[PDB]
Amino acid sequence: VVSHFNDCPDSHTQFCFHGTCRFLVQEDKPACVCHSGYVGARCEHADLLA
């Protein structure tokens, strides 16, 4: 089963502020997983409408 996901490489570590990084491999780009209550491409801001 093709992973489609693998651990975030040691070049974008601490790249994610309020979430856990991960490397979706198909297009060679990382992607956070924000916690409940944080929006933003890098898990930067807090969703004030909550």
Partner: protein, 614 residues
């Protein structure tokens, strides 16, 4: 009504906001009941069997459209008409459809964007989604603008079984789905040979207006489907009608009976009261580097700068701070002596903790004092982290006006979330011209709703959200209600110097109940309910007052010599006068000095020459 419901879109690129069924809720929350997305349209991580039926009402996307790692079989975006492409994904594209299959070659098969007819800017990328089919023959030169056809990437590898066909009632088997309606309807590469634009038929008899952006329903400017540049009340103009027209007959100017202000993408009658109004007629956010704003008779304008043309400071997310998140310790020096942030201030925990990704060393919390000179912010203020030793917003004790032109999530203009500060401490705020106010998640912060916030705002339809702070019934416990001097209006803090209106008198900038009118060195007066002291050399009297004015004349008597209606420590003993004379003035018994005789210029103890030794 003629106001299509708008949304703000998202700006997540590939980030997932929690669990699969907690991402879809955030997706459903933002895009439900939408007709015109003003931001972007991300549809990512929408797993099987979810009902994306709310998308059948979206009609425009003023940014890009990103369809990331979905698995749902069919996305009903069958009403999208145009993608203005104001912001590019991957700096190139304005519609990206990437890898819509989970792990085992199943997922998104249908995508019936049958009404999509124009992409004003940007290329299109399809890639790596081996289940989407029947989008394999669409002529992509009828939709994309003729300029970007060199930058389009396309990779169709639907190798998962097969799928239905689309009957030959459509152009050379060019279909968006499978059926009669789900197949393309060209409007750019079937036009006649004398109309530079869209069309609706293989004839010159029905070519569309130059300003229609997707295809007209009539040969006029009031019949366009989607306007291309502007919108003057249901007429897709090109530039809003000017305010003053030239006059070829008399080489002069006139006044347009129908002239509107260019507010962003529409012709309005009058600019909103918090936008800079230029002379041409335009709601500018912050006018030219030379000009400087100044309040006119009820509106804001800006005129040229004479002599010193002072510097202006761009906020975060604009100018040289284009891709900055917070005011980190690599751009705080640029705010060295600002007094007006032509932008908006973001403070995020990355400012203090310091980042390692984009090589940014941490901040020294003492450097945060540079902001103490800021007097107004044109955008918004987003505070998300403060030094823990601090008990209040100390660096903003001089903030006076938050204009509210740019907003956070399109709604909020003052956000103070998840802070460890016991009192807000903006003891000089006067007006939040536009936006909302959220103050929540401050685990120990008392003074939030004592202030009557309804009089700081200056535009109808402004709300406040203050929850999850330190409970009011606990501030009462630890003895934290504000002072007994502050009027029942508000209190930015516990100290008397932090009220909003002193009940009786205000010695300088701190509230008191009674000026010193009989006792105390500073015997002042209560003019304008502000204790103002007088010349110290005035005579102090224990029964009556000392003075009724700053001038040394209003005093009853004087502690030294008196010279007519005015008194001073010593009367003229070598002072300058009129017609180049050294005025000398001798004293008397009751300290009523009298001008010396014009002869002697050394000393004066008796009347005239009776105090002139040699």
């Amino acid at each position: 009504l003629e106001e299509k419901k708008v949304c703000q879109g998202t700006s997540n690129k590939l980030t997932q906001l929690g669990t699969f069924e907690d991402h879809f809720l955030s997706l459903q929350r933002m895009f439900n009941n939408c007709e015109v997305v003003l931001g972007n349209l991300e549809i990512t991580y929408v797993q099987r069997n979810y009902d994306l039926s709310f998308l059948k009402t979206i009609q425009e996307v003023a940014g890009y459209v990103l369809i990331a790692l979905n698995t749902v079989e069919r996305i009903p975006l069958e009403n999208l008409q145009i993608i203005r492409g104001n912001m590019y994904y991957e700096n190139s594209y304005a519609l990206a459809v990437l890898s819509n299959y989970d792990a085992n070659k199943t997922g998104l098969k249908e995508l019936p964007m049958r009404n999509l007819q124009e992409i004003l800017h940007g290329a299109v990328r399809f890639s790596n989604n081996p289940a989407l089919c029947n989008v394999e023959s669409i002529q992509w030169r009828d939709i994309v603008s003729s300029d970007f056809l060199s930058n389009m990437s396309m990779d169709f590898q639907n190798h998962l079984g097969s799928c239905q066909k689309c009957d030959p009632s459509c152009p050379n088997g060019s279909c968006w789905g499978a059926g009669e309606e789900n197949c393309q309807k060209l409007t750019k590469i079937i036009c006649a040979q004398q109309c530079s634009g869209r069309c609706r038929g293989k004839s010159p008899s029905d070519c569309c207006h130059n300003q229609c952006a997707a295809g007209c329903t009539g040969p006029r400017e009031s019949d366009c489907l989607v306007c291309r540049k502007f919108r003057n009340e249901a007429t897709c103009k090109d530039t809003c009608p000017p305010l003053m027209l030239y006059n070829p007959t008399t080489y002069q100017m006139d006044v347009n009976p129908e002239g509107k202000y260019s507010f962003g993408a529409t012709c309005v009658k009058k600019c909103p009261r918090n936008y800079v109004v230029t002379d041409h007629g335009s709601c500018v956010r912050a006018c030219g580097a030379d000009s400087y704003e100044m309040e006119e008779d009820g509106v804001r304008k800006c005129k040229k700068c004479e002599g010193p043309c002072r510097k202006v400071c761009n906020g975060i997310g604009i100018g040289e701070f284009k891709d900055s998140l917070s005011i980190n310790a690599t751009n705080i020096k640029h705010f060295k002596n600002c007094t007006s942030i032509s932008g908006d201030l973001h403070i995020l925990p990355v400012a203090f903790r310091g980042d390692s990704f984009t090589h940014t060393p941490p901040l020294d919390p003492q450097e945060l004092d540079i902001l103490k000179t800021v007097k107004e912010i044109t955008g918004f203020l987003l505070i998300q982290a403060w030094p823990e030793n601090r008990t209040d917003l100390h660096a903003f004790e001089n903030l006076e006006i938050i204009r509210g032109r740019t907003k956070q999530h399109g709604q909020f203009s003052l956000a103070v979330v998840s802070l460890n500060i016991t009192s807000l401490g903006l003891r000089s705020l006067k007006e939040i011209s536009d936006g909302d106010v959220i103050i929540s998640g401050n685990k120990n912060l008392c003074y939030a709703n004592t202030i009557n916030w309804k009089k700081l705002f200056g535009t109808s339809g402004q709300k406040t959200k203050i929850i999850s702070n330190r409970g009011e019934n606990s501030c009462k416990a630890t003895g934290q209600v504000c002072h007994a001097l502050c009027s029942p209006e508000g209190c930015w803090g516990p100290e008397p110097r932090d009220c909003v209106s002193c009940r009786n008198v205000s010695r300088g900038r701190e509230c008191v109940d009674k000026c010193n009118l009989l006792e105390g060195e500073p015997r002042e007066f209560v003019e304008n309910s502000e204790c103002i002291q007088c010349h110290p050399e005035c005579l102090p009297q224990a029964m009556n007052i000392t003075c009724t004015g700053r001038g040394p004349d209003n005093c009853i008597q004087c502690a030294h010599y008196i010279d007519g209606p005015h008194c001073v420590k010593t009367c003229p003993a070598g002072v300058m006068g009129e017609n180049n004379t050294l005025v000398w003035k001798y004293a008397d018994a009751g300290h009523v000095c009298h001008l010396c005789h014009p002869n002697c210029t050394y000393g004066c103890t008796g009347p005239g020459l009776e105090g002139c030794p040699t």
